[PDB]
Amino acid sequence: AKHLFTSESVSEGHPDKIADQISDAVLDAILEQDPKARVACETYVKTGMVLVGGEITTSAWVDIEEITRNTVREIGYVHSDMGFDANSCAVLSAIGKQGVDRADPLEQGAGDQGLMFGYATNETDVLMPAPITYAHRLVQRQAEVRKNGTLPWLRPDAKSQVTFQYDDGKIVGIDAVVLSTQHSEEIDQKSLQEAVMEEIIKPILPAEWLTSATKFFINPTGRFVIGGPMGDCGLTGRKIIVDTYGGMARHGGGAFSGKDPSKVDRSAAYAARYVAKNIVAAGLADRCEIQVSYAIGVAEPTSIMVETFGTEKVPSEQLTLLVREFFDLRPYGLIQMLDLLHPIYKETAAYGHFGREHFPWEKTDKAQLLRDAAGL
Amino acid sequence: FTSESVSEGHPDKIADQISDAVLDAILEQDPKARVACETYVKTGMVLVGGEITTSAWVDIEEITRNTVREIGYVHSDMGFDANSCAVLSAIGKQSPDINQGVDRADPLEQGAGDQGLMFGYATNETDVLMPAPITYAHRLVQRQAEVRKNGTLPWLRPDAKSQVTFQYDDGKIVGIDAVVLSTQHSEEIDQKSLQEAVMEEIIKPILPAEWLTSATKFFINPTGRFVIGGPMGDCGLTGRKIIVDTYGGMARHGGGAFSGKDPSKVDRSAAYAARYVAKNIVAAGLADRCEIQVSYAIGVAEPTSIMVETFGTEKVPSEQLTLLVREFFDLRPYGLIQMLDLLHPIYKETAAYGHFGREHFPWEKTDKAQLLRDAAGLK
Amino acid sequence: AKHLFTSESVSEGHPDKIADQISDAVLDAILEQDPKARVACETYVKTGMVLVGGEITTSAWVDIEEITRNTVREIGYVHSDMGFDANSCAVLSAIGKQGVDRADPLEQGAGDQGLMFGYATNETDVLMPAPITYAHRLVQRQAEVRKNGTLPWLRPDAKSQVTFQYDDGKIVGIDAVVLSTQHSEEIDQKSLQEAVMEEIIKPILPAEWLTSATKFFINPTGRFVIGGPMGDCGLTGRKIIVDTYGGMARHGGGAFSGKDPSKVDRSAAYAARYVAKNIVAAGLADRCEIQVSYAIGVAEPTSIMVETFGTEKVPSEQLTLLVREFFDLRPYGLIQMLDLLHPIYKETAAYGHFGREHFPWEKTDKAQLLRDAAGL
Amino acid sequence: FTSESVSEGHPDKIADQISDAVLDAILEQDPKARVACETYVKTGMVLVGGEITTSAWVDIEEITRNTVREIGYVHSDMGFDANSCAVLSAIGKQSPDINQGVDRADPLEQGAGDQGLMFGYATNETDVLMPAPITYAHRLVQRQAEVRKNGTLPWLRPDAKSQVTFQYDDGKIVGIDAVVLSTQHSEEIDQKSLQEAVMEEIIKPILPAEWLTSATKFFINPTGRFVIGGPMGDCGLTGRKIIVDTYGGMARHGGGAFSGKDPSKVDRSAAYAARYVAKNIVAAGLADRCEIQVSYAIGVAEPTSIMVETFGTEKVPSEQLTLLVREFFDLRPYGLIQMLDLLHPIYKETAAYGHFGREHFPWEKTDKAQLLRDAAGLK
Numbered sequence A, C: 001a002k003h004l005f006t007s008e009s010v011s012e013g014h015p016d017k018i019a020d021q022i023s024d025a026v027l028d029a030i031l032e033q034d035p036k037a038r039v040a041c042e043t044y045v046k047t048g049m050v051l052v053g054g055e056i057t058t059s060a061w062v063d064i065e066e067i068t069r070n071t072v073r074e075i076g077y078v079h080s081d082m083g084f085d086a087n088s089c090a091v092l093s094a095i096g097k098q099g100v101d102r103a104d105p106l107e108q109g110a111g112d113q114g115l116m117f118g119y120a121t122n123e124t125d126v127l128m129p130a131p132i133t134y135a136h137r138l139v140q141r142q143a144e145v146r147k148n149g150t151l152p153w154l155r156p157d158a159k160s161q162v163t164f165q166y167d168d169g170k171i172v173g174i175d176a177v178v179l180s181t182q183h184s185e186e187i188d189q190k191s192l193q194e195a196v197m198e199e200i201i202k203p204i205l206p207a208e209w210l211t212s213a214t215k216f217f218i219n220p221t222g223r224f225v226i227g228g229p230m231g232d233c234g235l236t237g238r239k240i241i242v243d244t245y246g247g248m249a250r251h252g253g254g255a256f257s258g259k260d261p262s263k264v265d266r267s268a269a270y271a272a273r274y275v276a277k278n279i280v281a282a283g284l285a286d287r288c289e290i291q292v293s294y295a296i297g298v299a300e301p302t303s304i305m306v307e308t309f310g311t312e313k314v315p316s317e318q319l320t321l322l323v324r325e326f327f328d329l330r331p332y333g334l335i336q337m338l339d340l341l342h343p344i345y346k347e348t349a350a351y352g353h354f355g356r357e358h359f360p361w362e363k364t365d366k367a368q369l370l371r372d373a374a375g376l
Numbered sequence B, D: 001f002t003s004e005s006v007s008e009g010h011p012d013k014i015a016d017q018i019s020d021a022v023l024d025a026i027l028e029q030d031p032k033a034r035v036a037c038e039t040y041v042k043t044g045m046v047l048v049g050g051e052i053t054t055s056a057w058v059d060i061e062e063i064t065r066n067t068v069r070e071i072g073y074v075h076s077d078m079g080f081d082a083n084s085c086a087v088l089s090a091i092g093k094q095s096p097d098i099n100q101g102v103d104r105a106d107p108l109e110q111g112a113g114d115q116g117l118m119f120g121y122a123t124n125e126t127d128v129l130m131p132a133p134i135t136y137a138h139r140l141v142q143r144q145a146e147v148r149k150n151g152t153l154p155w156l157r158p159d160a161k162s163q164v165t166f167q168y169d170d171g172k173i174v175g176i177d178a179v180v181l182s183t184q185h186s187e188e189i190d191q192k193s194l195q196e197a198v199m200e201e202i203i204k205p206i207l208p209a210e211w212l213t214s215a216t217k218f219f220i221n222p223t224g225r226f227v228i229g230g231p232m233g234d235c236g237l238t239g240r241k242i243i244v245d246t247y248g249g250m251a252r253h254g255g256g257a258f259s260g261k262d263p264s265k266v267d268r269s270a271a272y273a274a275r276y277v278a279k280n281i282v283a284a285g286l287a288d289r290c291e292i293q294v295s296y297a298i299g300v301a302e303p304t305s306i307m308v309e310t311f312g313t314e315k316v317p318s319e320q321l322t323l324l325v326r327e328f329f330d331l332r333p334y335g336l337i338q339m340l341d342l343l344h345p346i347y348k349e350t351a352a353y354g355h356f357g358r359e360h361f362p363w364e365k366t367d368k369a370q371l372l373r374d375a376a377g378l379k
């Protein structure tokens, strides 16, 4: 049936995303020395200050301040005229804290309870829903043209939102686009709107989806000079829908950034994405949602549901069987299936954990095996 | 299907309750205040930050300690003490270049304060029109009023987590296939006497639903000793339980957190309105399950999208539903506030045991169902 | 006997003095609404952040953030290139907390124990010791030429130190001068030294005391661009010797800033200065040190010692008698004798609480009465 | 004359002990580390900030909690708990544009790291050559080792303050004219039984000095109930007891704080050397009372001033003393370090009950007195 669906994203400069990146920069720094470290790093950014807290247990020795300043600096906050300066902001630290419980580590019980969802759809090339996919690309393009000097008056903080029109489960076009970007005093709003349209929006959104009825809200309130942590708190794990599927799929409720792979909240979400994407990549369904749940201390998932919204190209009972045959969804089994014990997570902390074809859980190395195990 | 909840002693929930305690305190004096209160709780301290624009004069430390006493932290043995903990505040005033004054001759036409997407959901699986798993997870952890009325004080400590795994045949509840209840306790009780008291003293609200067949896996303290909890050895932030606050995974979510936000923040008020729309659609008999998505663009009063999903359970053409909602509900940001009468200090009660399913809240009223049913042409 | 004596001072931009000024700016803001408020405000300034804490009890409603930013801004830290920005630094608050115990408030017992010292000497016009006096004037002159644009490349943080040569208890000249000033990248060290000599040192130090043997250490280590809270913590009450007599006199050990006048640690120190200065101003002695001590809950001082280092012009027993006849040294008696219940204390928090002739405890309105009560 | 001291339970002293605990921990691994550790203690939290340049890897929280346990805060009833309090750190690394490497072919010729003035003092009023009032104020509050060895645990809480008021005739001790001892206590003792136990159980170190004539005013808990103390309801910062740390008001002070500073900070090492010079002058019989002032200019190795004050008690021309000190002591910043053997983790013990008067410290040695007396030509 005809309907609209909307998703949003934010740039690496949005204060919530700043916190997520700092949390995963600390995780990456620790994993490079202690691949098996336990990390639960919560970050809280506000005017003038970064607070890094949580609980950690590792043999690694890390400089929290240096990691934090480097991260903020890469994001681009390097001057008080931007509202935040990586070189002079305060950095505060408030981090704290059986061994071989299984003969086979792959049989360790879940370190926590919870349910996670994976999703895939052949709407886009990356098998992600269209709204979240192009919302990410808009804020990522904003950062791209900000850093390479194409538009030097841009500033780090920005938000996007895309409203897609669907009909009979197929995409007809784009109904509304929102893009709010921080900027310096130099540029006027008229010049800003045209440059964002020409350098950010038009190069990213397929023209076939842009009709005369599409609304374009470019800095709808106008002046956007004060941004980032100034005038807006940022906390880790406050963008979990931006991080996953933009609302197209359900969500178990767990945040990703700041957590080592032993947190099923994170790695099982990655594994769920890995199965759903391989099912859709194998031609076994157009759209596929995977629900997995874990009981603490239990290795086998307490539930595995495969929903294909009537788009399955083989019986539903055979899909759920293939999922069990080709994927190891035990907490520490999926860690090895995805090779998650490496410092690869700072890159996930902005622009979406799902959609980019270089992360382990985005590989489709099992798609050909799945359709072979089903016929075609 | 599986869904989980947490108690008022959980650190994340502590942060929500503090943020809404601060909000409620401000609304008592300035019902039109702008509040964005973000709370951080860690071993030994509370940090309350954010931005507020109000004429009210409140006491953040006093509000914070009172919130923590009620939750039941008044001694260092529990791992946290509301009387001796540290309370830091980092709250700024009016963010420059925002409040442009009147702006609109009709205040109901004001633009939204931010972009964003919100979801509402209703299902006639229960007399409160909520999804089954999440609904009784709250009532489970909420029966800790026994430890306040001295019904049974014993050994239980606040921090708790529930998980119920149902299974469906044709969208109908088959039964309970797995119950996970992990609770913090004291040293004055063993894991054997614990798991027996846990499986017995959780039945008074859980109803005579003997859905626990011979194939229902129970996990009461499956890991073992659970003595240290709360902020001690675990960090809590507001807005880190948004799936617990809403529909426990059954319905989708837009990502916005509720606590610490005044009603002019669409992230909260529009989620409430979405629940108000879906519950009234179901209550009116126009559908058995209903999910609503709204979205806003900053500075725009009209929602940029409205989607009504009935999952094939509608009793009237779906396009008709979308039109009924557009006219029978005022989904403009400041029309929601008037439609729900939201400018009141009612939000601390929400930050604890679910924002939906408790029918004394304005967005739980089904005062439009009959009107909707009449306009829909049924009967 | 011949000897050298040295004292130091710091500018309003030195991080310890930043904390003192913030503490007394909060005190002033409270006293303007609640003259009888109880204030004990401790401030802690570091890279990017100001922490204001302590214990207060008042009917006043004050905006700690606004008071703090205004204070830092007046000091001059307004840009991340200076290492600190009043507009974007973090401000954290950690403030907490019988009535009519006496029929006559003047008889209330001391709110705390302690001993305090006052000092006066006719060496200088303001009846202060020479070293501390001119150390203050150097850093105060540094700030004066920084703000009025005479030397716009100066920055707020600076330190001074003057070594005086004494002989037979009389001043012969100045043996060494140290002046370290923060500055921007623009100025080179050679140009900086000459400008500090011409605009700061020479206009302040009497030429009769500057001989060819006087050492001048102007930015002895050279480059001084990073200053203020960056690279150096500041805490309230860490300059108590700069605040009093530069070491020429003994010190009871109590800090001034952040305390309301009910803290004998502060107001009794002021009263002691008031008596010593009036004794010297009356011609009753060349140099005079006053020691007073208080027992908690006791109104009358538990000791009053008057030391005149052999310079007394009347018998010692008569000086101590005159002190008791003309000065009310009870805790709440000296408050009324000096009219201390007004927001006058932010001005004391840099450049010395003693020496400036507009504070109440620097008035010599009793000098003529003292010498009349003794003859001449 | 009057002088006061405080115990290791006083919040300011807690901050000093933490700063030197951190310093000592670093020196154990890097004896040449640069440390400037500033500690803030408030109800429920410790904030450890400053700057350090070291190759050592320490644990600030672990060091902090251990320091607070020893002081005796392990339960929320005392107002503070070392196991549940918050510990924040804000410690930066090498301040840019400072360490220029070698700089000098003879390391003893390095310039001072900062300007500043320092005082030392010695008097033969006591076998430790310290002023009377302050010397036994420390030993008073230090006898709280009874509450550690279970000698007498009872009701006393850490926070305590002493004050003794002597009087002089011709520089000779006449007697005690006023004793003020206010101590924090528990609810398991009244102010009557308190003041009796306070006046009786403080005599074991106070010696048979019955200087308490009929005119000696005693003030034991003169205000009354003293139950809440420590960081609870009172703020503590390092370097806020510098007169207690030194000579209790008898001698003058340069303003620099000791704790949290490594020996290359003249604010500490030169104050120690000043005490070393004065004590050796008195011990050698060259004077009965001696006060020394030194000062430094940043980047200059030679003190910018040295003043010897004998208060008329010298037994040799005063100008000769100033010359003897210049040659028999190396008062250059890095010569002090070698002269006193300061690159060792010995500083936490100083942050508690006075930096001077305890003869096992390097700066309390009188190993030059005889040499000084020989060079002075006496006997």
Ligand SMILES: O=c1ccn([C@@H]2O[C@H](COP(=O)(O)OP(=O)(O)NP(=O)(O)O)[C@@H](O)[C@H]2O)c(=O)[nH]1
Pocket: A300, A324, A325, A327, A328, A329, A330, A333
């Ligand atoms: O109560 C029960 C629950 C499950 N079972 C059976 O356990 C079987 C599952 O075996 P398994 O977990 O070892 O298979 P798996 O592929 O998931 N193993 P891996 O994850 O690839 O390592 C099921 O066939 C189920 O019928 C019972 O017999 N009784």
Ligand SMILES: O=c1ccn([C@@H]2O[C@H](COP(=O)(O)OP(=O)(O)NP(=O)(O)O)[C@@H](O)[C@H]2O)c(=O)[nH]1
Pocket: C300, C324, C325, C327, C328, C329, C330, C333
């Ligand atoms: O034990 C004692 C101590 C003091 N005294 C006497 O109290 C007298 C002090 O009186 P006072 O305190 O009222 O005089 P004052 O000028 O200080 N009063 P004010 O501070 O100006 O209000 C002294 O003369 C002293 O001899 C005793 O008789 N016995």
Ligand SMILES: [Mg+2]
Pocket: A232, A233, A234, B036, B038, B050
């Ligand atoms: Mg926020």
Ligand SMILES: [Mg+2]
Pocket: B116, B255, B256, B267
């Ligand atoms: Mg949002």
Ligand SMILES: [Mg+2]
Pocket: C232, C233, C234, D036, D038, D050
């Ligand atoms: Mg410092």
Ligand SMILES: [Mg+2]
Pocket: D116, D255, D256, D267
């Ligand atoms: Mg100093």
